Coordinates of C-alpha atoms and ligand atoms in Angstrom, one line a residue:
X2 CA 87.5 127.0 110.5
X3 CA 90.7 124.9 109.9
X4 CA 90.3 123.0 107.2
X5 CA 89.5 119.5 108.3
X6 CA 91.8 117.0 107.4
X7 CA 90.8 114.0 104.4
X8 CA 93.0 111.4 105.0
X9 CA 92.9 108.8 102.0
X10 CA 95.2 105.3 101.8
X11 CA 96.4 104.7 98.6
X12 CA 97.6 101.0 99.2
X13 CA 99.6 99.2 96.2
X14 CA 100.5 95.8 96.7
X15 CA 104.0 95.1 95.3
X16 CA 103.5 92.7 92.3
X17 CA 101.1 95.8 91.0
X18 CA 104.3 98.4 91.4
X19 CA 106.3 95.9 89.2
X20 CA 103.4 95.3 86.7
X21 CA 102.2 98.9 87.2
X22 CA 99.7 100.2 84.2
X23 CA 96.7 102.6 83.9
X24 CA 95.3 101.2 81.4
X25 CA 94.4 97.8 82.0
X26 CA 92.3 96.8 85.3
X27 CA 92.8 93.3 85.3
X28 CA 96.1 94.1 86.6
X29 CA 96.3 97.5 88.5
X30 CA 92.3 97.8 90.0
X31 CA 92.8 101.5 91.4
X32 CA 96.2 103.2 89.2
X33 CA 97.0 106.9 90.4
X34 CA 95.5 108.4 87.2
X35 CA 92.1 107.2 88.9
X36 CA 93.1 110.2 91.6
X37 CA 91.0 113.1 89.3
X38 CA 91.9 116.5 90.3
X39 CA 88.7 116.5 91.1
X40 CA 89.3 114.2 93.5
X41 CA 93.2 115.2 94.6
X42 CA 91.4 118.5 95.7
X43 CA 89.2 116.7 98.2
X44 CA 92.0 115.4 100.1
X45 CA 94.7 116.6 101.9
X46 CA 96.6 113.7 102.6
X47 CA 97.0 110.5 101.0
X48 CA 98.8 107.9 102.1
X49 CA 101.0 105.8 100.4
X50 CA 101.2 102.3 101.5
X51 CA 103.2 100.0 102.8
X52 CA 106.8 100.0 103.3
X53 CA 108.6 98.2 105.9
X54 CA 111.2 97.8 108.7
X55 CA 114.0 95.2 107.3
X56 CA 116.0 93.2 109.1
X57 CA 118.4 95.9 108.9
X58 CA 116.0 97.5 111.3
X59 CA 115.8 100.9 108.8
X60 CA 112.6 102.1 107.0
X61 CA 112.6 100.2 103.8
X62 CA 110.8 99.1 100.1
X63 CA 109.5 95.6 100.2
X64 CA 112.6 93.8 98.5
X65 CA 111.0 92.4 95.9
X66 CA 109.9 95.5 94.9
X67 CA 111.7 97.4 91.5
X68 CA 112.7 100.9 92.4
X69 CA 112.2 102.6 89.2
X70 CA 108.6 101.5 88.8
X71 CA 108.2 102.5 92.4
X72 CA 109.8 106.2 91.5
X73 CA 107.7 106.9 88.6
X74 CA 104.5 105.8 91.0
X75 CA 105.4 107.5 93.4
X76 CA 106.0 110.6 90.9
X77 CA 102.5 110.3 89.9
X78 CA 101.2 110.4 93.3
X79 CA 103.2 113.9 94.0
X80 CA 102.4 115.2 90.6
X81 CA 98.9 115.5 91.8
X82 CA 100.1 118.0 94.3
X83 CA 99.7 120.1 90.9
X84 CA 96.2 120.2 91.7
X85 CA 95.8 121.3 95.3
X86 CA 98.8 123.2 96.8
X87 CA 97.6 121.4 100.7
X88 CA 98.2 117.8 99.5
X89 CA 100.6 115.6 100.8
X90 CA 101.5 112.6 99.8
X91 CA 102.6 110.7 102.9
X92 CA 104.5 107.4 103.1
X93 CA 102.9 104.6 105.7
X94 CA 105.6 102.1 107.0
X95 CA 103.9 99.0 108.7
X96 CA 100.0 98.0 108.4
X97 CA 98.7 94.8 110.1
X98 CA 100.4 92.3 107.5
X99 CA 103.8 93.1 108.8
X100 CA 103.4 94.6 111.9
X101 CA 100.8 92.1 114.0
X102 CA 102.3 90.5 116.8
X103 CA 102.5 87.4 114.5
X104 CA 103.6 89.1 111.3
X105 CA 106.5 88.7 109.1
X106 CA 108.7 91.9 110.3
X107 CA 107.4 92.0 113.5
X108 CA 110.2 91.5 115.4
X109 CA 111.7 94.4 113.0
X110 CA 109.4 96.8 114.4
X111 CA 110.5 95.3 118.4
X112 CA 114.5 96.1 118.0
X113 CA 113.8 99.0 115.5
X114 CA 113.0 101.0 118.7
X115 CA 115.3 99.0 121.3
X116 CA 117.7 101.6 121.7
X117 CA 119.0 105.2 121.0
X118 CA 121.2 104.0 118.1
X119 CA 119.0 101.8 116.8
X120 CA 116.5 104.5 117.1
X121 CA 118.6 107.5 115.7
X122 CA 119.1 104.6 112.9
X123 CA 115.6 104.0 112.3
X124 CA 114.6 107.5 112.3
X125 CA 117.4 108.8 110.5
X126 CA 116.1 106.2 107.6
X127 CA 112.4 107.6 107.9
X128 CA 114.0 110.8 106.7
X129 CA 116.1 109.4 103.9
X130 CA 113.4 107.8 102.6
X131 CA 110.9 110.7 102.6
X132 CA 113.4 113.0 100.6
X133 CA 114.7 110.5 98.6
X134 CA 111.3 109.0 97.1
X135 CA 109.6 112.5 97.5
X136 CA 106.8 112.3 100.2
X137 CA 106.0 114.9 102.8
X138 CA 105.7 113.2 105.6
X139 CA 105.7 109.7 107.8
X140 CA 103.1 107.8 109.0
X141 CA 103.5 104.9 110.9
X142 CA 101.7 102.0 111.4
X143 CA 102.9 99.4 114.3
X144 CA 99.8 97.7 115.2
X145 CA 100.7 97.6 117.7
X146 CA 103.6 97.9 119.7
X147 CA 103.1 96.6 123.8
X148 CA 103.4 97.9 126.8
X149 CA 107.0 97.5 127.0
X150 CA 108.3 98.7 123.9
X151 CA 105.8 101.7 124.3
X152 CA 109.1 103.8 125.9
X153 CA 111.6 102.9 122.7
X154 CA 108.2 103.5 120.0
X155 CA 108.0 107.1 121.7
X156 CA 111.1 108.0 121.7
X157 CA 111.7 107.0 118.2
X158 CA 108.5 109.1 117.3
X159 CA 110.4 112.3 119.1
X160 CA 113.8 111.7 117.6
X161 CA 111.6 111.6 113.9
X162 CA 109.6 114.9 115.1
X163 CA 113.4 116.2 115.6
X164 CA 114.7 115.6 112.8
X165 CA 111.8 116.4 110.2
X166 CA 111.5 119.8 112.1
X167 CA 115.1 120.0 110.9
X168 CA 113.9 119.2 107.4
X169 CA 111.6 121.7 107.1
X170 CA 113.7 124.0 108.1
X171 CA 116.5 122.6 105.6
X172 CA 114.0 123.2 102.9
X173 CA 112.0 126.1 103.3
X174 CA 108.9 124.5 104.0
X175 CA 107.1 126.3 106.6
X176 CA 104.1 126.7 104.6
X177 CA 103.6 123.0 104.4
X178 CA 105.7 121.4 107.2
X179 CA 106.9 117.7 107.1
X180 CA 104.4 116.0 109.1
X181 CA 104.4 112.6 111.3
X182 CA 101.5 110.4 111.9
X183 CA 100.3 106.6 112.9
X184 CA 97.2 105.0 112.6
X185 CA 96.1 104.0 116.2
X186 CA 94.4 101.7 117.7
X187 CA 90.2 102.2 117.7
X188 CA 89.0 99.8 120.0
X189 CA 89.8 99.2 123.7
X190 CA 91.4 96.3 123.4
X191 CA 94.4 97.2 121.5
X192 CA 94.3 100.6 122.5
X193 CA 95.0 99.2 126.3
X194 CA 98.2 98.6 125.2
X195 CA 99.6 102.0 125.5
X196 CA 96.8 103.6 126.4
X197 CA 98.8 105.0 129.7
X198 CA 101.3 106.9 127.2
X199 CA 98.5 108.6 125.1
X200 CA 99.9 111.7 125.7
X201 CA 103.7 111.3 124.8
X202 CA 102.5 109.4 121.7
X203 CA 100.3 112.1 120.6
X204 CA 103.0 114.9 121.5
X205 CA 105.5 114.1 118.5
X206 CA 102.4 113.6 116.7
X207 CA 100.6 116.4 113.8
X208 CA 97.7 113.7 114.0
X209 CA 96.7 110.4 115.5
X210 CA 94.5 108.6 112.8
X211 CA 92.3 106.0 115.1
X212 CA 91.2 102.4 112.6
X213 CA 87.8 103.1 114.7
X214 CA 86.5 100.5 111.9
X215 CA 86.5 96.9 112.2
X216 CA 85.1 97.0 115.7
X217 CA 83.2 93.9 114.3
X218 CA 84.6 90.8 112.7
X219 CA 84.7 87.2 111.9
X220 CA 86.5 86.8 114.8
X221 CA 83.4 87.1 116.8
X222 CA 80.7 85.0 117.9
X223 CA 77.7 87.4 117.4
X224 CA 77.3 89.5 113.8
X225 CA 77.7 93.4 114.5
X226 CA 78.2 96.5 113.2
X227 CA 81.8 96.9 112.4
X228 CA 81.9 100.7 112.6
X229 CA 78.8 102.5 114.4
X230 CA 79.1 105.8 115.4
X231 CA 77.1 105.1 118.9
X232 CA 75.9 102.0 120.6
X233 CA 72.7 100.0 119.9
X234 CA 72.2 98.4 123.6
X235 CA 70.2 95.4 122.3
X236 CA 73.8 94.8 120.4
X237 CA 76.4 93.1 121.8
X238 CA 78.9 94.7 124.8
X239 CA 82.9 94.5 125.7
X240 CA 84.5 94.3 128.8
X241 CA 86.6 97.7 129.2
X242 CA 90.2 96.7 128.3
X243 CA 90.9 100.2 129.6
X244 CA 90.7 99.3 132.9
X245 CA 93.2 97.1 133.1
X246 CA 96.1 99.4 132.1
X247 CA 98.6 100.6 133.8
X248 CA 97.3 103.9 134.9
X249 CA 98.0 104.0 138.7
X250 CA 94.2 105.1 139.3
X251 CA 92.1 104.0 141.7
X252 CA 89.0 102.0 142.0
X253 CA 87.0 105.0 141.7
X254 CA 88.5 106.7 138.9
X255 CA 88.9 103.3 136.8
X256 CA 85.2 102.7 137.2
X257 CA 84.3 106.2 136.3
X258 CA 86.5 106.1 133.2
X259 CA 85.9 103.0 132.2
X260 CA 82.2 101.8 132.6
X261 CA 82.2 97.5 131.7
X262 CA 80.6 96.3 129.8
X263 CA 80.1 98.9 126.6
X264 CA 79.5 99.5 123.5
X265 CA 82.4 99.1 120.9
X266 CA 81.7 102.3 118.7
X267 CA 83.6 105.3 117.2
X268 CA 82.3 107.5 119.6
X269 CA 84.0 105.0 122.8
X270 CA 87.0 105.2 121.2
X271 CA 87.3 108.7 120.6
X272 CA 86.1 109.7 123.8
X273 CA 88.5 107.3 125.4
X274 CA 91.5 109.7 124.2
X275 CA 89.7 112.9 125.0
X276 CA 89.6 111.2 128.5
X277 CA 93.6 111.2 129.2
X278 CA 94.8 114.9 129.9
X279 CA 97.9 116.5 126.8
X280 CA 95.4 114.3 124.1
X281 CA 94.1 117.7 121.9
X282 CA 90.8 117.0 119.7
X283 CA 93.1 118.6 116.7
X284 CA 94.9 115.4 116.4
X285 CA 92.5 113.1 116.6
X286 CA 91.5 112.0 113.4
X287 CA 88.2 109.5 112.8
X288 CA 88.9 106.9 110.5
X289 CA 86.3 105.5 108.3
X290 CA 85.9 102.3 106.3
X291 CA 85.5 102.3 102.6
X292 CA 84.3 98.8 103.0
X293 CA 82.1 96.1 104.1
X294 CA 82.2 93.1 105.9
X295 CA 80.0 90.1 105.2
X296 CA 79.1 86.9 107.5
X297 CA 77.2 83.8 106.2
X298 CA 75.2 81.8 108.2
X299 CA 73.3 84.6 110.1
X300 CA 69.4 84.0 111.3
X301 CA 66.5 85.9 110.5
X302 CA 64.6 88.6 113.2
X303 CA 67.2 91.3 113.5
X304 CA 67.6 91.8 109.8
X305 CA 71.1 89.7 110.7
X306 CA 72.6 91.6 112.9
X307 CA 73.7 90.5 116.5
X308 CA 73.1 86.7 115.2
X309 CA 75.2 83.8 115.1
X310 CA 77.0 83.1 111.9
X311 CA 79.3 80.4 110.4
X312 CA 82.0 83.2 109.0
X313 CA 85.5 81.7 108.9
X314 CA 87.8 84.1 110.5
X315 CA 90.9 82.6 109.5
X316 CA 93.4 84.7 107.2
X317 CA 93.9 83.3 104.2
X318 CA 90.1 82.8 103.6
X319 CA 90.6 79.2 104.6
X320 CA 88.3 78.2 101.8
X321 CA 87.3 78.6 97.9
X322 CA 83.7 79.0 98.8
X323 CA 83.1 82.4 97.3
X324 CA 79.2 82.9 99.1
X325 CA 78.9 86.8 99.1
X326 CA 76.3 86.5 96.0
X327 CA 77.4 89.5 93.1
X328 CA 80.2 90.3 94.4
X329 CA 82.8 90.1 91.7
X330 CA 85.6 91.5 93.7
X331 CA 85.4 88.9 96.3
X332 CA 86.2 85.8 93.3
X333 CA 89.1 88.6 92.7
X334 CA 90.4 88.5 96.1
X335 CA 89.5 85.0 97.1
X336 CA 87.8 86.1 99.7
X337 CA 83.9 87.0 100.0
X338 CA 84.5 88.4 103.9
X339 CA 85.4 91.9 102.6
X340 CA 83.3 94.2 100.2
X341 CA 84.5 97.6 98.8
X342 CA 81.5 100.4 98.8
X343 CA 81.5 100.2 94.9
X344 CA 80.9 96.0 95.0
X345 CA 78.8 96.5 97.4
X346 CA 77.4 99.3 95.5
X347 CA 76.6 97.2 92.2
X348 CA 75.5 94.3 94.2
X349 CA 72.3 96.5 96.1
X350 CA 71.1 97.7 92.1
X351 CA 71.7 94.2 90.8
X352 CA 68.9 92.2 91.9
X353 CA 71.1 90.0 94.0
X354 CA 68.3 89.7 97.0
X355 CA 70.2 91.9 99.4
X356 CA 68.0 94.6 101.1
X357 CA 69.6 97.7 102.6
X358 CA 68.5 98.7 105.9
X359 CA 69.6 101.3 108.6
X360 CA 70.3 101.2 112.4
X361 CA 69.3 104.4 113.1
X362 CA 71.1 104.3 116.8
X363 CA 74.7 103.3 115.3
X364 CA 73.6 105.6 112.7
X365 CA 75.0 103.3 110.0
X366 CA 73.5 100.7 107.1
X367 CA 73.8 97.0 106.7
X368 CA 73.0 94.6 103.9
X369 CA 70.9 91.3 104.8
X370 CA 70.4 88.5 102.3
X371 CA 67.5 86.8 104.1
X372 CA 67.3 83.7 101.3
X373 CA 71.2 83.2 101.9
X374 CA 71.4 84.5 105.4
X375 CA 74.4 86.9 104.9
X376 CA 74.8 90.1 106.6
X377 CA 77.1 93.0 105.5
X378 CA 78.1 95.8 108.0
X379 CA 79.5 98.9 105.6
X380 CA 79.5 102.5 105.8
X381 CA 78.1 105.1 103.2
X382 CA 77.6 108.8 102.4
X383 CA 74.6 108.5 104.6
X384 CA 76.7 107.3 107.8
X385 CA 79.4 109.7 106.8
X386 CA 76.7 112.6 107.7
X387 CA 76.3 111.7 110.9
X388 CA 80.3 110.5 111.2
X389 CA 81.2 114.3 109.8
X390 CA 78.5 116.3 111.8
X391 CA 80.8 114.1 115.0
X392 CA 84.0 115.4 113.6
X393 CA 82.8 118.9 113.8
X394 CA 81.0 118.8 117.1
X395 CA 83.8 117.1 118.9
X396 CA 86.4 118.9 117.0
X397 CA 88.8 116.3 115.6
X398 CA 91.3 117.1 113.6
X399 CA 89.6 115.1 110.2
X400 CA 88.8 112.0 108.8
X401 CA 91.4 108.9 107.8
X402 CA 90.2 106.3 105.1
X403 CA 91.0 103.0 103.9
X404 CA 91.1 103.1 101.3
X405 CA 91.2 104.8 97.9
X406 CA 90.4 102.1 95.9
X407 CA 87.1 100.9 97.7
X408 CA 85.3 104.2 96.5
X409 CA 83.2 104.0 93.6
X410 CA 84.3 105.1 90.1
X411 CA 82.5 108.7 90.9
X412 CA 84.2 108.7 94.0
X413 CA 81.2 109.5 96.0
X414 CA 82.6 108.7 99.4
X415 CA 85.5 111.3 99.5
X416 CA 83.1 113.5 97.8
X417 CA 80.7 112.9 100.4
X418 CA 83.2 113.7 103.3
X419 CA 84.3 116.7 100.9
X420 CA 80.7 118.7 100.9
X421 CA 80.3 117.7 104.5
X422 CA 82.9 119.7 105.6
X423 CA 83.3 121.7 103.1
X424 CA 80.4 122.7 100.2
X425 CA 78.8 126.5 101.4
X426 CA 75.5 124.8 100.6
X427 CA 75.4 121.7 102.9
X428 CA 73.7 122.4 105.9
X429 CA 73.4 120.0 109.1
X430 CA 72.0 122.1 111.7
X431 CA 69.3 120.1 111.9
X432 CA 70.5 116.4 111.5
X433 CA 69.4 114.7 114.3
X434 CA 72.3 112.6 116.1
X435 CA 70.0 110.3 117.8
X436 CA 70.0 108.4 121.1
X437 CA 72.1 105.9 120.1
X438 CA 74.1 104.7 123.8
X439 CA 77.2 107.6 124.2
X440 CA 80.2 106.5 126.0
X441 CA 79.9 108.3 129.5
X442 CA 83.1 107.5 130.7
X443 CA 84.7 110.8 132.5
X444 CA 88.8 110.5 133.0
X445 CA 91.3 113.5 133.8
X446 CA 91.3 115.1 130.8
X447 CA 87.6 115.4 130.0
X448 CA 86.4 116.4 133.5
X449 CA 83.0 119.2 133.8
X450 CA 83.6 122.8 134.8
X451 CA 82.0 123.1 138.0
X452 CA 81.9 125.4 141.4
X453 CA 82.5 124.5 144.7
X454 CA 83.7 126.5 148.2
X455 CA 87.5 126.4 148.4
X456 CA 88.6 123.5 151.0
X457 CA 88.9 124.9 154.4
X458 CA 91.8 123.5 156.1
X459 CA 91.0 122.0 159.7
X460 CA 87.6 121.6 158.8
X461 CA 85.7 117.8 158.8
X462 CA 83.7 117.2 155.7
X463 CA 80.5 114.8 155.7
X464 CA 80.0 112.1 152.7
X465 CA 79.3 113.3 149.5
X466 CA 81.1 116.6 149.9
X467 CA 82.0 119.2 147.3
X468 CA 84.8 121.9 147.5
X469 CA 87.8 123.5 145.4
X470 CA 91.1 123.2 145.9
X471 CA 94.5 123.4 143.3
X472 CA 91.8 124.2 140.5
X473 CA 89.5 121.2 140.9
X474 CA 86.6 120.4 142.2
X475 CA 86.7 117.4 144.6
X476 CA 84.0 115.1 146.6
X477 CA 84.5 112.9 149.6
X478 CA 83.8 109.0 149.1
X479 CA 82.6 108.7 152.4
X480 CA 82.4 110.3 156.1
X481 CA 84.3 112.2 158.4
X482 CA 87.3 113.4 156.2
X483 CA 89.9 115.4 158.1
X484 CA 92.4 115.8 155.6
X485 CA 92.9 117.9 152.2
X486 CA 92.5 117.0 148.4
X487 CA 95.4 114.9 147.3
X488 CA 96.7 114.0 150.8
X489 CA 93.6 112.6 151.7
X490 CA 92.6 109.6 149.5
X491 CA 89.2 110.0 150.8
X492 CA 88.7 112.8 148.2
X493 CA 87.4 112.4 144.4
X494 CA 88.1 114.8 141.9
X495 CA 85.2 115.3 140.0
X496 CA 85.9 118.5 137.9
X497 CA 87.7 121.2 137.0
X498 CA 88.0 125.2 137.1
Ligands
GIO1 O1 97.1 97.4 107.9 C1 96.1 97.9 107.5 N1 94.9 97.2 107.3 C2 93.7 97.8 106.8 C3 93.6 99.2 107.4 O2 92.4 99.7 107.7 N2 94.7 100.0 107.6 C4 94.8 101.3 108.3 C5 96.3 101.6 108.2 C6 96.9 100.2 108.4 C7 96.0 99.4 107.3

């Protein structure tokens, strides 16, 4: 009955703060007076984005960027807490652009963390920034930082959980604590890169916001969905990143955790943090997509999905070829790879030769355009059912969003996500989840309840045993064991209580 959270980004790129307007599209798309109080009421967080890390290695405004314009947006975007009395209006610092590995302030983000002064420095600037501009809270976005700069990213997420405590504190906001939180990784592959430290990310943490989105791109061979709730097995499969991290497991309980190949959905990647012990379901937040992806050069028989395609996956669109047929936007945006809902919206009533169809396993919709052979992976208010029924089952703290703008004038999408969760006359008992492929994988903090005789000491145990002992439940991986759980590696445990 806690309020599930509604995470929406509210990204503005910096020539549009120093041009801002609300009156004239051409040159601010999505202005803050496009936030109704209708619409402010069916969040609870928004997040503004992106600042940076300078060289100066402190949380910082893009330079170019003029501070009063930035104020009075910002203003508008608290003014809204007028509204609803929950909302935040949180500041992100990062995002792919400047945090990839390849970015521009990447190597910002590297020292930022190096050390305890540079740290105290950083996160001491986090803070400034929040009071100063206004926001309630900090949300960082490193994606993402490696193995070895995993130590330096947590403890600069403690030292910030320190100090906002502090702040709250300072200014009597109890009822609406600062909060901290980073978008995190949603598929296996960059999630294995701190994937060990789950736990002491997530501590600091009010909520982990997964980018379980994307999951298909470009950047791969076959077309796929690029967000499905649960696998399709005639769609393509990953090898397990997961078990390749530095866990310190063994054969046994890598394998079990981390079954290879699988399927790349929502559900693998959520279920992949409920597998690692201290990761609560509170914090983890699903995030969604409020757009599409197209590919070009798809073939017919699966309605274009899990075909080849000629999609360049370059960045800049390496090419003035706008092929994604209506959509406007794309020409915009000179690039016709990514869709909002309300393009793609538009372009499904225009007569445009795209015909919607469902995967009813991913439990999500897809456009094909079998004269042109394009194919659009998106989500919708449909998908959301199924993606909000998740969140309520598996008992994640919410839903994250990127981003604001991509909804449709009505703002159907966070309306959608609203009544889901929250309209007394929406009912879902019955929606049927499916059989779409689940990810099976059990680790040490998802493990069954089960029963077993307590572990007799001195006595020899057979293959295939079951018994308790230290409040699991263990099983021998082959014959004649001698020896206690946990002194005896010849012992699995395979659940708990
Ligand atoms: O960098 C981004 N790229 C698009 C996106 O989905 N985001 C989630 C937060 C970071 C941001």
């Amino acid at each position: 009955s806690t309020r599930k959270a509604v995470i929406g980004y509210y990204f503005i790129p910096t020539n549009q703060i120093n041009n801002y307007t609300e009156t004239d599209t051409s040159v601010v798309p999505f202005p803050v007076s496009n936030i109704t109080p209708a619409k402010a009421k069916q969040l609870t967080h928004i997040n503004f984005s992106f600042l940076d890390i300078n060289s100066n290695l402190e949380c910082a405004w893009d330079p170019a960027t003029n501070d009063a314009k930035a104020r009075d947006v910002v203003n508008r975007l608290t003014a809204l807490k007028a509204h609803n009395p929950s909302l935040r209006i949180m500041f992100s610092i990062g995002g792919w652009y400047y945090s990839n590995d390849l970015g521009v302030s990447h190597a910002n983000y590297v020292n930022a963390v190096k050390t305890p002064a540079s740290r105290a420095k950083f996160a001491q600037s986090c803070v400034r920034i929040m009071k100063d501009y206004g926001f309630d809270g900090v949300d960082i976005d490193w994606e993402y930082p490696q193995a070895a700069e995993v130590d330096g990213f947590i403890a600069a997420l403690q030292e910030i959980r320190t100090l906002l405590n502090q702040q709250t504190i300072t200014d009597g906001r109890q009822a609406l604590p600062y909060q901290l939180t980073i978008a995190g990784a949603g598929g296996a592959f960059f999630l294995s890169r701190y994937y060990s430290k789950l736990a002491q990310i997530v501590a600091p943490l009010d909520y982990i916001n997964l980018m379980t989105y994307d999951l298909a791109g470009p950047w791969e061979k076959v077309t796929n969905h690029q967000a499905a709730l649960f696998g399709d097995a005639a769609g393509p499969t990953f090898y397990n990143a997961l078990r390749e991290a530095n866990l310190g497991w063994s054969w046994e309980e890598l394998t079990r955790a981390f079954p290879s190949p699988f399927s790349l959905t929502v559900d693998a990647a959520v279920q992949q943090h409920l597998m690692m012990e201290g990761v609560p379901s509170a914090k983890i937040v699903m995030g969604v997509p409020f757009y599409g992806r197209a590919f070009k050069g798809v073939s017919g028989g699966n309605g274009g999905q899990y075909s080849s395609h000629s999609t360049p996956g370059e960045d800049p669109y390496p090419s003035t070829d706008y092929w994604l047929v209506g959509c406007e936007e794309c020409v915009r945006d000179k690039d016709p790879r990514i869709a909002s809902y309300r393009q793609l919206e538009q372009m499904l009533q225009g007569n445009y030769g795209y015909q919607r169809l469902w995967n009813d396993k991913t439990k999500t919709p897809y456009l094909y355009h079998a004269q042109n052979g394009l194919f659009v992976t998106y989500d919708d208010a449909e998908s959301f059912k199924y993606k909000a029924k998740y969140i309520k089952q598996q008992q994640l703290g919410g839903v994250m969003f990127w981003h604001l703008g991509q909804d449709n004038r009505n703002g159907d999408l966070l309306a959608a996500l609203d009544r889901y969760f929250n309209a007394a006359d929406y009912d879902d008992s019955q929606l049927d989840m499916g059989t779409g492929l689940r990810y099976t994988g059990v680790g040490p903090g998802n493990l069954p309840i089960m029963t077993a005789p307590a572990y007799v000491p001195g006595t020899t145990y057979a293959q295939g045993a079951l018994v308790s002992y230290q409040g699991y439940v263990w099983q021998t991986k082959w014959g004649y064991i001698t020896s206690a759980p946990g002194s005896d590696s010849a012992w699995l445990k395979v659940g708990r209580v």
